[PDB]
């Protein structure tokens, strides 16, 4: 009971370049999502929350646990060969989730 977190589900090992990506995530029982939380795509080994490459506001559960999702459009997604991951950054800037790494290949 030390850290309410966001758990990313069904994370692929790789995503085909040029294709849209849907990010699946669930909340722990005691995590409370807030208005300006966001799920950002970061390079692995990032150090600050401002190092995101693209982000999406959280699909705010309008009625408070179930499977959530957010769709990342291929136009905002990276095209290089680096290792990336999903990260849940809440309103206050602390990261509550970090997904398994993946590439865009």
mmCIF file of N, CA, C and O in Angstrom:
data_model
loop_
_atom_site.group_PDB
_atom_site.id
_atom_site.type_symbol
_atom_site.label_atom_id
_atom_site.label_comp_id
_atom_site.label_asym_id
_atom_site.label_seq_id
_atom_site.Cartn_x
_atom_site.Cartn_y
_atom_site.Cartn_z
ATOM 1 N N UNK A 1 0.827 -1.202 0.000
ATOM 2 C CA UNK A 1 0.000 0.000 0.000
ATOM 3 C C UNK A 1 0.863 1.254 0.000
ATOM 4 O O UNK A 1 0.543 2.238 0.668
ATOM 5 N N UNK A 2 1.957 1.220 -0.760
ATOM 6 C CA UNK A 2 2.935 2.297 -0.740
ATOM 7 C C UNK A 2 2.884 3.193 -1.972
ATOM 8 O O UNK A 2 3.475 4.278 -1.947
ATOM 9 N N UNK A 3 2.195 2.781 -3.035
ATOM 10 C CA UNK A 3 2.186 3.552 -4.272
ATOM 11 C C UNK A 3 1.067 3.105 -5.202
ATOM 12 O O UNK A 3 1.186 2.074 -5.872
ATOM 13 N N UNK A 4 -0.024 3.866 -5.251
ATOM 14 C CA UNK A 4 -1.053 3.625 -6.252
ATOM 15 C C UNK A 4 -0.487 3.909 -7.637
ATOM 16 O O UNK A 4 0.109 4.966 -7.869
ATOM 17 N N UNK A 5 -0.666 2.966 -8.557
ATOM 18 C CA UNK A 5 0.012 3.008 -9.842
ATOM 19 C C UNK A 5 -0.973 2.758 -10.977
ATOM 20 O O UNK A 5 -2.130 2.384 -10.765
ATOM 21 N N UNK A 6 -0.488 2.975 -12.197
ATOM 22 C CA UNK A 6 -1.214 2.665 -13.421
ATOM 23 C C UNK A 6 -0.472 1.541 -14.128
ATOM 24 O O UNK A 6 0.740 1.636 -14.357
ATOM 25 N N UNK A 7 -1.194 0.478 -14.468
ATOM 26 C CA UNK A 7 -0.618 -0.727 -15.055
ATOM 27 C C UNK A 7 -0.986 -0.754 -16.533
ATOM 28 O O UNK A 7 -2.170 -0.703 -16.885
ATOM 29 N N UNK A 8 0.023 -0.840 -17.395
ATOM 30 C CA UNK A 8 -0.185 -0.931 -18.834
ATOM 31 C C UNK A 8 -0.327 -2.394 -19.239
ATOM 32 O O UNK A 8 0.473 -3.239 -18.826
ATOM 33 N N UNK A 9 -1.342 -2.685 -20.048
ATOM 34 C CA UNK A 9 -1.669 -4.048 -20.439
ATOM 35 C C UNK A 9 -1.478 -4.242 -21.939
ATOM 36 O O UNK A 9 -1.579 -3.295 -22.725
ATOM 37 N N UNK A 10 -1.196 -5.491 -22.321
ATOM 38 C CA UNK A 10 -1.130 -5.904 -23.725
ATOM 39 C C UNK A 10 -0.115 -5.077 -24.512
ATOM 40 O O UNK A 10 -0.305 -4.789 -25.697
ATOM 41 N N UNK A 11 0.979 -4.700 -23.851
ATOM 42 C CA UNK A 11 2.013 -3.915 -24.515
ATOM 43 C C UNK A 11 2.776 -4.803 -25.487
ATOM 44 O O UNK A 11 3.314 -5.851 -25.107
ATOM 45 N N UNK A 12 2.825 -4.387 -26.749
ATOM 46 C CA UNK A 12 3.545 -5.140 -27.761
ATOM 47 C C UNK A 12 5.052 -4.998 -27.567
ATOM 48 O O UNK A 12 5.540 -4.073 -26.912
ATOM 49 N N UNK A 13 5.793 -5.943 -28.147
ATOM 50 C CA UNK A 13 7.243 -5.809 -28.200
ATOM 51 C C UNK A 13 7.672 -4.815 -29.270
ATOM 52 O O UNK A 13 8.750 -4.219 -29.164
ATOM 53 N N UNK A 14 6.843 -4.622 -30.294
ATOM 54 C CA UNK A 14 7.141 -3.698 -31.376
ATOM 55 C C UNK A 14 5.834 -3.248 -32.009
ATOM 56 O O UNK A 14 4.832 -3.969 -31.979
ATOM 57 N N UNK A 15 5.851 -2.047 -32.578
ATOM 58 C CA UNK A 15 4.706 -1.491 -33.285
ATOM 59 C C UNK A 15 5.128 -1.150 -34.704
ATOM 60 O O UNK A 15 6.197 -0.566 -34.914
ATOM 61 N N UNK A 16 4.296 -1.521 -35.672
ATOM 62 C CA UNK A 16 4.650 -1.295 -37.076
ATOM 63 C C UNK A 16 4.721 0.204 -37.343
ATOM 64 O O UNK A 16 3.806 0.949 -36.941
ATOM 65 N N UNK A 17 5.784 0.704 -37.974
ATOM 66 C CA UNK A 17 5.858 2.139 -38.269
ATOM 67 C C UNK A 17 4.722 2.578 -39.181
ATOM 68 O O UNK A 17 4.276 1.836 -40.059
ATOM 69 N N UNK A 18 4.251 3.803 -38.954
ATOM 70 C CA UNK A 18 3.147 4.353 -39.710
ATOM 71 C C UNK A 18 1.772 3.924 -39.250
ATOM 72 O O UNK A 18 0.775 4.437 -39.774
ATOM 73 N N UNK A 19 1.677 3.010 -38.290
ATOM 74 C CA UNK A 19 0.397 2.525 -37.800
ATOM 75 C C UNK A 19 0.048 3.139 -36.456
ATOM 76 O O UNK A 19 0.922 3.378 -35.623
ATOM 77 N N UNK A 20 -1.244 3.393 -36.259
ATOM 78 C CA UNK A 20 -1.716 3.936 -34.996
ATOM 79 C C UNK A 20 -1.564 2.907 -33.882
ATOM 80 O O UNK A 20 -1.675 1.697 -34.101
ATOM 81 N N UNK A 21 -1.308 3.401 -32.674
ATOM 82 C CA UNK A 21 -1.093 2.562 -31.502
ATOM 83 C C UNK A 21 -2.146 2.904 -30.461
ATOM 84 O O UNK A 21 -2.358 4.081 -30.146
ATOM 85 N N UNK A 22 -2.807 1.879 -29.933
ATOM 86 C CA UNK A 22 -3.740 2.035 -28.826
ATOM 87 C C UNK A 22 -3.074 1.553 -27.545
ATOM 88 O O UNK A 22 -2.582 0.422 -27.479
ATOM 89 N N UNK A 23 -3.046 2.419 -26.537
ATOM 90 C CA UNK A 23 -2.352 2.152 -25.285
ATOM 91 C C UNK A 23 -3.363 1.697 -24.239
ATOM 92 O O UNK A 23 -4.237 2.472 -23.839
ATOM 93 N N UNK A 24 -3.238 0.449 -23.797
ATOM 94 C CA UNK A 24 -4.164 -0.144 -22.842
ATOM 95 C C UNK A 24 -3.575 -0.084 -21.439
ATOM 96 O O UNK A 24 -2.415 -0.457 -21.228
ATOM 97 N N UNK A 25 -4.380 0.377 -20.485
ATOM 98 C CA UNK A 25 -3.919 0.550 -19.117
ATOM 99 C C UNK A 25 -5.092 0.391 -18.162
ATOM 100 O O UNK A 25 -6.233 0.723 -18.493
ATOM 101 N N UNK A 26 -4.796 -0.128 -16.974
ATOM 102 C CA UNK A 26 -5.756 -0.212 -15.886
ATOM 103 C C UNK A 26 -5.181 0.475 -14.655
ATOM 104 O O UNK A 26 -3.967 0.663 -14.531
ATOM 105 N N UNK A 27 -6.069 0.855 -13.744
ATOM 106 C CA UNK A 27 -5.681 1.513 -12.506
ATOM 107 C C UNK A 27 -5.669 0.507 -11.364
ATOM 108 O O UNK A 27 -6.497 -0.409 -11.321
ATOM 109 N N UNK A 28 -4.726 0.680 -10.443
ATOM 110 C CA UNK A 28 -4.809 -0.042 -9.186
ATOM 111 C C UNK A 28 -6.029 0.440 -8.404
ATOM 112 O O UNK A 28 -6.615 1.485 -8.700
ATOM 113 N N UNK A 29 -6.410 -0.342 -7.392
ATOM 114 C CA UNK A 29 -7.682 -0.103 -6.714
ATOM 115 C C UNK A 29 -7.742 1.289 -6.094
ATOM 116 O O UNK A 29 -8.796 1.934 -6.107
ATOM 117 N N UNK A 30 -6.624 1.775 -5.559
ATOM 118 C CA UNK A 30 -6.607 3.034 -4.826
ATOM 119 C C UNK A 30 -6.001 4.185 -5.619
ATOM 120 O O UNK A 30 -5.775 5.259 -5.051
ATOM 121 N N UNK A 31 -5.736 3.999 -6.909
ATOM 122 C CA UNK A 31 -5.290 5.111 -7.736
ATOM 123 C C UNK A 31 -6.493 5.932 -8.178
ATOM 124 O O UNK A 31 -7.500 5.377 -8.632
ATOM 125 N N UNK A 32 -6.385 7.244 -8.045
ATOM 126 C CA UNK A 32 -7.464 8.164 -8.417
ATOM 127 C C UNK A 32 -6.986 8.989 -9.598
ATOM 128 O O UNK A 32 -6.074 9.824 -9.455
ATOM 129 N N UNK A 33 -7.538 8.796 -10.795
ATOM 130 C CA UNK A 33 -7.131 9.610 -11.941
ATOM 131 C C UNK A 33 -7.642 11.035 -11.806
ATOM 132 O O UNK A 33 -8.697 11.290 -11.222
ATOM 133 N N UNK A 34 -6.876 11.970 -12.358
ATOM 134 C CA UNK A 34 -7.201 13.383 -12.273
ATOM 135 C C UNK A 34 -7.276 13.989 -13.670
ATOM 136 O O UNK A 34 -6.907 13.366 -14.669
ATOM 137 N N UNK A 35 -7.760 15.233 -13.716
ATOM 138 C CA UNK A 35 -8.104 15.871 -14.986
ATOM 139 C C UNK A 35 -6.913 15.941 -15.931
ATOM 140 O O UNK A 35 -6.995 15.508 -17.087
ATOM 141 N N UNK A 36 -5.793 16.483 -15.459
ATOM 142 C CA UNK A 36 -4.655 16.766 -16.318
ATOM 143 C C UNK A 36 -3.549 15.723 -16.202
ATOM 144 O O UNK A 36 -2.381 16.042 -16.455
ATOM 145 N N UNK A 37 -3.885 14.490 -15.825
ATOM 146 C CA UNK A 37 -2.942 13.400 -16.004
ATOM 147 C C UNK A 37 -2.743 13.142 -17.494
ATOM 148 O O UNK A 37 -3.597 13.462 -18.326
ATOM 149 N N UNK A 38 -1.597 12.561 -17.836
ATOM 150 C CA UNK A 38 -1.314 12.277 -19.234
ATOM 151 C C UNK A 38 -0.436 11.041 -19.348
ATOM 152 O O UNK A 38 0.329 10.714 -18.437
ATOM 153 N N UNK A 39 -0.568 10.356 -20.478
ATOM 154 C CA UNK A 39 0.262 9.210 -20.825
ATOM 155 C C UNK A 39 1.195 9.660 -21.938
ATOM 156 O O UNK A 39 0.746 9.973 -23.049
ATOM 157 N N UNK A 40 2.490 9.706 -21.645
ATOM 158 C CA UNK A 40 3.487 10.164 -22.594
ATOM 159 C C UNK A 40 4.344 9.017 -23.092
ATOM 160 O O UNK A 40 4.501 7.999 -22.413
ATOM 161 N N UNK A 41 4.891 9.183 -24.291
ATOM 162 C CA UNK A 41 5.836 8.236 -24.867
ATOM 163 C C UNK A 41 7.234 8.807 -24.679
ATOM 164 O O UNK A 41 7.549 9.885 -25.199
ATOM 165 N N UNK A 42 8.067 8.093 -23.930
ATOM 166 C CA UNK A 42 9.403 8.548 -23.586
ATOM 167 C C UNK A 42 10.442 7.585 -24.139
ATOM 168 O O UNK A 42 10.180 6.390 -24.303
ATOM 169 N N UNK A 43 11.626 8.116 -24.427
ATOM 170 C CA UNK A 43 12.775 7.262 -24.681
ATOM 171 C C UNK A 43 13.197 6.590 -23.382
ATOM 172 O O UNK A 43 13.125 7.191 -22.306
ATOM 173 N N UNK A 44 13.624 5.329 -23.480
ATOM 174 C CA UNK A 44 14.052 4.607 -22.289
ATOM 175 C C UNK A 44 15.244 5.324 -21.666
ATOM 176 O O UNK A 44 16.095 5.889 -22.366
ATOM 177 N N UNK A 45 15.287 5.337 -20.338
ATOM 178 C CA UNK A 45 16.328 6.064 -19.643
ATOM 179 C C UNK A 45 16.102 7.554 -19.541
ATOM 180 O O UNK A 45 17.049 8.293 -19.251
ATOM 181 N N UNK A 46 14.879 8.021 -19.784
ATOM 182 C CA UNK A 46 14.557 9.428 -19.585
ATOM 183 C C UNK A 46 14.805 9.824 -18.135
ATOM 184 O O UNK A 46 14.761 8.994 -17.224
ATOM 185 N N UNK A 47 15.058 11.111 -17.920
ATOM 186 C CA UNK A 47 15.358 11.612 -16.586
ATOM 187 C C UNK A 47 14.369 12.647 -16.073
ATOM 188 O O UNK A 47 14.188 12.750 -14.858
ATOM 189 N N UNK A 48 13.721 13.406 -16.953
ATOM 190 C CA UNK A 48 12.735 14.399 -16.551
ATOM 191 C C UNK A 48 11.426 14.143 -17.282
ATOM 192 O O UNK A 48 11.405 13.566 -18.372
ATOM 193 N N UNK A 49 10.325 14.584 -16.668
ATOM 194 C CA UNK A 49 9.009 14.369 -17.258
ATOM 195 C C UNK A 49 8.788 15.210 -18.510
ATOM 196 O O UNK A 49 7.863 14.921 -19.277
ATOM 197 N N UNK A 50 9.611 16.232 -18.736
ATOM 198 C CA UNK A 50 9.492 17.068 -19.923
ATOM 199 C C UNK A 50 10.174 16.464 -21.144
ATOM 200 O O UNK A 50 10.172 17.093 -22.207
ATOM 201 N N UNK A 51 10.751 15.268 -21.020
ATOM 202 C CA UNK A 51 11.422 14.598 -22.123
ATOM 203 C C UNK A 51 10.478 13.718 -22.937
ATOM 204 O O UNK A 51 10.939 12.805 -23.632
ATOM 205 N N UNK A 52 9.174 13.969 -22.864
ATOM 206 C CA UNK A 52 8.217 13.202 -23.646
ATOM 207 C C UNK A 52 8.338 13.549 -25.124
ATOM 208 O O UNK A 52 8.736 14.655 -25.499
ATOM 209 N N UNK A 53 7.987 12.586 -25.973
ATOM 210 C CA UNK A 53 7.995 12.791 -27.416
ATOM 211 C C UNK A 53 6.611 13.080 -27.969
ATOM 212 O O UNK A 53 6.468 13.900 -28.881
ATOM 213 N N UNK A 54 5.593 12.422 -27.429
ATOM 214 C CA UNK A 54 4.210 12.821 -27.630
ATOM 215 C C UNK A 54 3.413 12.291 -26.451
ATOM 216 O O UNK A 54 3.824 11.341 -25.779
ATOM 217 N N UNK A 55 2.277 12.928 -26.194
ATOM 218 C CA UNK A 55 1.481 12.598 -25.027
ATOM 219 C C UNK A 55 0.005 12.674 -25.379
ATOM 220 O O UNK A 55 -0.392 13.239 -26.401
ATOM 221 N N UNK A 56 -0.809 12.088 -24.506
ATOM 222 C CA UNK A 56 -2.256 12.136 -24.614
ATOM 223 C C UNK A 56 -2.830 12.291 -23.216
ATOM 224 O O UNK A 56 -2.374 11.632 -22.277
ATOM 225 N N UNK A 57 -3.814 13.174 -23.078
ATOM 226 C CA UNK A 57 -4.519 13.289 -21.810
ATOM 227 C C UNK A 57 -5.205 11.969 -21.483
ATOM 228 O O UNK A 57 -5.625 11.224 -22.373
ATOM 229 N N UNK A 58 -5.305 11.673 -20.188
ATOM 230 C CA UNK A 58 -5.873 10.401 -19.764
ATOM 231 C C UNK A 58 -7.362 10.371 -20.083
ATOM 232 O O UNK A 58 -8.067 11.383 -19.962
ATOM 233 N N UNK A 59 -7.840 9.213 -20.534
ATOM 234 C CA UNK A 59 -9.274 9.004 -20.678
ATOM 235 C C UNK A 59 -9.897 8.994 -19.292
ATOM 236 O O UNK A 59 -9.956 7.946 -18.641
ATOM 237 N N UNK A 60 -10.339 10.156 -18.826
ATOM 238 C CA UNK A 60 -10.840 10.285 -17.466
ATOM 239 C C UNK A 60 -12.062 9.397 -17.264
ATOM 240 O O UNK A 60 -13.092 9.615 -17.922
ATOM 241 N N UNK A 61 -11.995 8.389 -16.388
ATOM 242 C CA UNK A 61 -13.185 7.575 -16.112
ATOM 243 C C UNK A 61 -14.275 8.424 -15.486
ATOM 244 O O UNK A 61 -14.153 8.857 -14.336
ATOM 245 N N UNK A 62 -15.350 8.664 -16.233
ATOM 246 C CA UNK A 62 -16.354 9.650 -15.852
ATOM 247 C C UNK A 62 -17.210 9.162 -14.689
ATOM 248 O O UNK A 62 -18.070 9.898 -14.194
ATOM 249 N N UNK A 63 -16.986 7.921 -14.241
ATOM 250 C CA UNK A 63 -17.810 7.355 -13.180
ATOM 251 C C UNK A 63 -17.006 6.452 -12.248
ATOM 252 O O UNK A 63 -17.560 5.515 -11.661
ATOM 253 N N UNK A 64 -15.713 6.726 -12.098
ATOM 254 C CA UNK A 64 -14.843 6.010 -11.158
ATOM 255 C C UNK A 64 -14.967 4.488 -11.250
ATOM 256 O O UNK A 64 -14.277 3.756 -10.542
ATOM 257 N N UNK A 65 -13.040 -0.466 -11.071
ATOM 258 C CA UNK A 65 -11.905 -0.419 -11.985
ATOM 259 C C UNK A 65 -12.215 -1.172 -13.275
ATOM 260 O O UNK A 65 -12.820 -2.244 -13.249
ATOM 261 N N UNK A 66 -11.791 -0.607 -14.403
ATOM 262 C CA UNK A 66 -12.084 -1.181 -15.708
ATOM 263 C C UNK A 66 -10.910 -0.909 -16.640
ATOM 264 O O UNK A 66 -10.026 -0.100 -16.344
ATOM 265 N N UNK A 67 -10.907 -1.605 -17.774
ATOM 266 C CA UNK A 67 -9.873 -1.408 -18.780
ATOM 267 C C UNK A 67 -10.069 -0.070 -19.485
ATOM 268 O O UNK A 67 -11.155 0.225 -19.993
ATOM 269 N N UNK A 68 -9.016 0.738 -19.509
ATOM 270 C CA UNK A 68 -9.007 2.012 -20.209
ATOM 271 C C UNK A 68 -8.081 1.928 -21.415
ATOM 272 O O UNK A 68 -7.303 0.982 -21.568
ATOM 273 N N UNK A 69 -8.172 2.932 -22.281
ATOM 274 C CA UNK A 69 -7.326 2.957 -23.465
ATOM 275 C C UNK A 69 -7.224 4.379 -23.994
ATOM 276 O O UNK A 69 -8.123 5.200 -23.794
ATOM 277 N N UNK A 70 -6.106 4.655 -24.658
ATOM 278 C CA UNK A 70 -5.892 5.908 -25.368
ATOM 279 C C UNK A 70 -5.167 5.580 -26.667
ATOM 280 O O UNK A 70 -4.313 4.687 -26.707
ATOM 281 N N UNK A 71 -5.537 6.271 -27.741
ATOM 282 C CA UNK A 71 -5.015 5.976 -29.069
ATOM 283 C C UNK A 71 -3.978 7.022 -29.452
ATOM 284 O O UNK A 71 -4.266 8.224 -29.442
ATOM 285 N N UNK A 72 -2.778 6.562 -29.789
ATOM 286 C CA UNK A 72 -1.703 7.423 -30.260
ATOM 287 C C UNK A 72 -1.702 7.410 -31.783
ATOM 288 O O UNK A 72 -1.501 6.358 -32.398
ATOM 289 N N UNK A 73 -1.937 8.572 -32.387
ATOM 290 C CA UNK A 73 -1.943 8.664 -33.840
ATOM 291 C C UNK A 73 -0.526 8.527 -34.384
ATOM 292 O O UNK A 73 0.436 9.016 -33.787
ATOM 293 N N UNK A 74 -0.405 7.855 -35.532
ATOM 294 C CA UNK A 74 0.906 7.577 -36.107
ATOM 295 C C UNK A 74 1.657 8.842 -36.497
ATOM 296 O O UNK A 74 2.888 8.809 -36.603
ATOM 297 N N UNK A 75 0.951 9.953 -36.714
ATOM 298 C CA UNK A 75 1.629 11.191 -37.083
ATOM 299 C C UNK A 75 2.446 11.753 -35.927
ATOM 300 O O UNK A 75 3.470 12.407 -36.156
ATOM 301 N N UNK A 76 2.021 11.511 -34.688
ATOM 302 C CA UNK A 76 2.730 12.005 -33.514
ATOM 303 C C UNK A 76 3.748 11.008 -32.971
ATOM 304 O O UNK A 76 4.421 11.314 -31.982
ATOM 305 N N UNK A 77 3.884 9.821 -33.597
ATOM 306 C CA UNK A 77 4.746 8.775 -33.067
ATOM 307 C C UNK A 77 6.152 8.869 -33.655
ATOM 308 O O UNK A 77 6.329 9.316 -34.793
ATOM 309 N N UNK A 78 7.165 8.457 -32.896
ATOM 310 C CA UNK A 78 8.539 8.503 -33.406
ATOM 311 C C UNK A 78 8.756 7.503 -34.530
ATOM 312 O O UNK A 78 8.054 6.498 -34.659
ATOM 313 N N UNK A 79 9.763 7.796 -35.354
ATOM 314 C CA UNK A 79 10.080 6.985 -36.520
ATOM 315 C C UNK A 79 11.463 6.350 -36.462
ATOM 316 O O UNK A 79 11.837 5.636 -37.401
ATOM 317 N N UNK A 80 12.227 6.578 -35.399
ATOM 318 C CA UNK A 80 13.614 6.139 -35.337
ATOM 319 C C UNK A 80 13.704 4.738 -34.732
ATOM 320 O O UNK A 80 12.709 4.020 -34.609
ATOM 321 N N UNK A 81 14.917 4.337 -34.343
ATOM 322 C CA UNK A 81 15.196 2.984 -33.876
ATOM 323 C C UNK A 81 15.463 2.922 -32.375
ATOM 324 O O UNK A 81 16.062 1.953 -31.897
ATOM 325 N N UNK A 82 15.038 3.932 -31.622
ATOM 326 C CA UNK A 82 15.268 3.936 -30.187
ATOM 327 C C UNK A 82 14.243 3.056 -29.474
ATOM 328 O O UNK A 82 13.220 2.656 -30.038
ATOM 329 N N UNK A 83 14.533 2.749 -28.212
ATOM 330 C CA UNK A 83 13.608 2.009 -27.364
ATOM 331 C C UNK A 83 12.712 2.991 -26.621
ATOM 332 O O UNK A 83 13.202 3.929 -25.983
ATOM 333 N N UNK A 84 11.404 2.777 -26.705
ATOM 334 C CA UNK A 84 10.422 3.670 -26.110
ATOM 335 C C UNK A 84 9.561 2.913 -25.106
ATOM 336 O O UNK A 84 9.604 1.685 -25.013
ATOM 337 N N UNK A 85 8.768 3.672 -24.354
ATOM 338 C CA UNK A 85 7.889 3.096 -23.346
ATOM 339 C C UNK A 85 6.783 4.089 -23.030
ATOM 340 O O UNK A 85 6.933 5.299 -23.220
ATOM 341 N N UNK A 86 5.662 3.558 -22.550
ATOM 342 C CA UNK A 86 4.592 4.395 -22.035
ATOM 343 C C UNK A 86 4.904 4.816 -20.604
ATOM 344 O O UNK A 86 5.538 4.079 -19.842
ATOM 345 N N UNK A 87 4.455 6.014 -20.241
ATOM 346 C CA UNK A 87 4.637 6.522 -18.888
ATOM 347 C C UNK A 87 3.411 7.322 -18.484
ATOM 348 O O UNK A 87 2.954 8.186 -19.237
ATOM 349 N N UNK A 88 2.886 7.030 -17.297
ATOM 350 C CA UNK A 88 1.738 7.740 -16.748
ATOM 351 C C UNK A 88 2.251 8.821 -15.803
ATOM 352 O O UNK A 88 2.813 8.515 -14.748
ATOM 353 N N UNK A 89 2.054 10.079 -16.183
ATOM 354 C CA UNK A 89 2.438 11.231 -15.376
ATOM 355 C C UNK A 89 1.159 11.936 -14.947
ATOM 356 O O UNK A 89 0.355 12.344 -15.794
ATOM 357 N N UNK A 90 0.967 12.080 -13.638
ATOM 358 C CA UNK A 90 -0.275 12.642 -13.134
ATOM 359 C C UNK A 90 -0.202 14.168 -13.084
ATOM 360 O O UNK A 90 0.766 14.790 -13.532
ATOM 361 N N UNK A 91 -1.251 14.772 -12.520
ATOM 362 C CA UNK A 91 -1.365 16.227 -12.473
ATOM 363 C C UNK A 91 -0.154 16.870 -11.809
ATOM 364 O O UNK A 91 0.336 17.910 -12.264
ATOM 365 N N UNK A 92 0.344 16.264 -10.733
ATOM 366 C CA UNK A 92 1.417 16.855 -9.945
ATOM 367 C C UNK A 92 2.804 16.580 -10.512
ATOM 368 O O UNK A 92 3.787 17.090 -9.965
ATOM 369 N N UNK A 93 2.915 15.791 -11.578
ATOM 370 C CA UNK A 93 4.176 15.578 -12.255
ATOM 371 C C UNK A 93 4.924 14.322 -11.856
ATOM 372 O O UNK A 93 5.959 14.023 -12.464
ATOM 373 N N UNK A 94 4.446 13.584 -10.859
ATOM 374 C CA UNK A 94 5.090 12.339 -10.458
ATOM 375 C C UNK A 94 4.601 11.215 -11.360
ATOM 376 O O UNK A 94 3.412 11.135 -11.695
ATOM 377 N N UNK A 95 5.523 10.351 -11.780
ATOM 378 C CA UNK A 95 5.183 9.266 -12.693
ATOM 379 C C UNK A 95 4.606 8.100 -11.898
ATOM 380 O O UNK A 95 5.189 7.654 -10.901
ATOM 381 N N UNK A 96 3.437 7.618 -12.324
ATOM 382 C CA UNK A 96 2.752 6.527 -11.649
ATOM 383 C C UNK A 96 2.779 5.225 -12.435
ATOM 384 O O UNK A 96 2.319 4.202 -11.918
ATOM 385 N N UNK A 97 3.297 5.231 -13.653
ATOM 386 C CA UNK A 97 3.350 4.023 -14.457
ATOM 387 C C UNK A 97 4.466 4.099 -15.472
ATOM 388 O O UNK A 97 4.835 5.181 -15.938
ATOM 389 N N UNK A 98 5.010 2.933 -15.810
ATOM 390 C CA UNK A 98 6.059 2.826 -16.819
ATOM 391 C C UNK A 98 5.926 1.466 -17.483
ATOM 392 O O UNK A 98 6.027 0.436 -16.810
ATOM 393 N N UNK A 99 5.698 1.462 -18.791
ATOM 394 C CA UNK A 99 5.402 0.236 -19.511
ATOM 395 C C UNK A 99 6.682 -0.484 -19.931
ATOM 396 O O UNK A 99 7.784 0.067 -19.898
ATOM 397 N N UNK A 100 6.512 -1.743 -20.328
ATOM 398 C CA UNK A 100 7.618 -2.531 -20.881
ATOM 399 C C UNK A 100 8.158 -1.825 -22.117
ATOM 400 O O UNK A 100 7.366 -1.277 -22.911
ATOM 401 N N UNK A 101 9.474 -1.772 -22.325
ATOM 402 C CA UNK A 101 10.005 -1.089 -23.510
ATOM 403 C C UNK A 101 9.540 -1.741 -24.804
ATOM 404 O O UNK A 101 9.169 -2.916 -24.847
ATOM 405 N N UNK A 102 9.559 -0.945 -25.872
ATOM 406 C CA UNK A 102 9.194 -1.417 -27.199
ATOM 407 C C UNK A 102 9.895 -0.553 -28.236
ATOM 408 O O UNK A 102 10.388 0.537 -27.932
ATOM 409 N N UNK A 103 9.939 -1.053 -29.468
ATOM 410 C CA UNK A 103 10.468 -0.297 -30.590
ATOM 411 C C UNK A 103 9.369 -0.065 -31.616
ATOM 412 O O UNK A 103 8.318 -0.710 -31.594
ATOM 413 N N UNK A 104 9.634 0.866 -32.528
ATOM 414 C CA UNK A 104 8.758 1.118 -33.670
ATOM 415 C C UNK A 104 9.439 0.512 -34.891
ATOM 416 O O UNK A 104 10.181 1.180 -35.612
ATOM 417 N N UNK A 105 9.191 -0.776 -35.110
ATOM 418 C CA UNK A 105 9.825 -1.513 -36.196
ATOM 419 C C UNK A 105 8.897 -2.595 -36.737
ATOM 420 O O UNK A 105 7.857 -2.891 -36.149
#
